[PDB]
Structure 1
Amino acid sequence: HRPVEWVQAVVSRFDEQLPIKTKVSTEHNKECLINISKYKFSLVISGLTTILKNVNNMRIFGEAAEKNLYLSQLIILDTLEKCLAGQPKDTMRLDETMLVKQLLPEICHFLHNQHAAELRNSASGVLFSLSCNNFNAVFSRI
């Protein structure tokens, strides 16, 4: 259990492989995150969403913003794509737990300059993959 906590070290390795914070190791790390997310799902998505919230709140002044944020948002979002399409298919209810922590970053994404447009497609695909299960939470909010 507590030796199996290596998944958090995998999350931290994914942080060190972020462009804002060897590429074969990044590919193997991403593939392992997707492979773990089939069986153990909540820890992987919780870690990745803490990552995306952190990437949202850092480093605005540099050009490192407009290039590394631009790449890293696609990296986090397509890992979320392959995680949600890795067939969890169980509710594990989490209606106000983590999905509420999902949707405010999501409307932070597609609430509203040149770099935004293809991020909107990836966020829309993320919502498309996400709303295959638990329609009731977003229905109650809407």
Structure 2
Amino acid sequence: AHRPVEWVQAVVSRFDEQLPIKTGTHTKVSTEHNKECLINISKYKFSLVISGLTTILKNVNNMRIFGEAAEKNLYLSQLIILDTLEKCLAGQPKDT
């Protein structure tokens, strides 16, 4: 099943694990390496990385945040997601 794609999905699942909105510093040191993983993958995954990031961002945007701290956590989560996406797009060459 082209297991590189499987490991890209595994990294997506790891992004699902680390969640300022949901989880609320285990996902702080490796998370930077975990997000650098996708940042580097964007140069090679391209379409798959974009699709995964877009799905994550849409899921974050399509939320409720009824509580008080939930909105504050989602504010940081969406900012981090957008920064990662922008870095991935900047890294991705125009030849893609």
Same-fold call, TM cutoff 0.5: yes
Deviation at 1:57, TM superposition (A): 1.1
Structure 2: gaps (5+ residues): none
Query: Which TM-score applies when normalising by structure 2?
Result: 0.85
Aligned length: 91
RMSD of aligned C-alpha atoms? Answer: 1.5
Structure 1: gaps (5+ residues): 92-142
Higher helix share: 2
Instruction: Give the distance between the partners of 2:3 and 2:92, measured in 1 at CA.
Output: 26
Deviation at 1:73, TM superposition (A): 0.9
The answer as to whether partners of 1:18 and 1:72 remain within 8 angstroms in 2 is: yes
Cα distance change of structure 1 residues 41 and 3 upon mapping to structure 2, 3 Å threshold:
closer
Deviation at 1:4, TM superposition (A): 4.1
Instruction: Give the distance between the partners of 1:30 and 1:2, measured in 2 at CA.
Output: 19
Percent pairwise identity = 100
Deviation at 1:62, TM superposition (A): 0.9
Instruction: Give the distance between the partners of 1:32 and 1:67, measured in 2 at CA.
Output: 26
The answer as to whether partners of 2:15 and 2:34 remain within 8 angstroms in 1 is: yes
The answer as to whether partners of 1:41 and 1:88 remain within 8 angstroms in 2 is: no
Query: Which TM-score applies when normalising by structure 1?
Result: 0.59
Instruction: Give the distance between the partners of 2:79 and 2:33, measured in 1 at CA.
Output: 17
Structure 2 partner of 1:98: none
**Structure 1 consecutive aligned stretches of length 4 or more whose deviation exceeds 3 Å:** none
Secondary structure of 2:21's aligned partner: coil
Structure with the bigger RCO (C-alpha within 8 Å, sep 6+) is 2
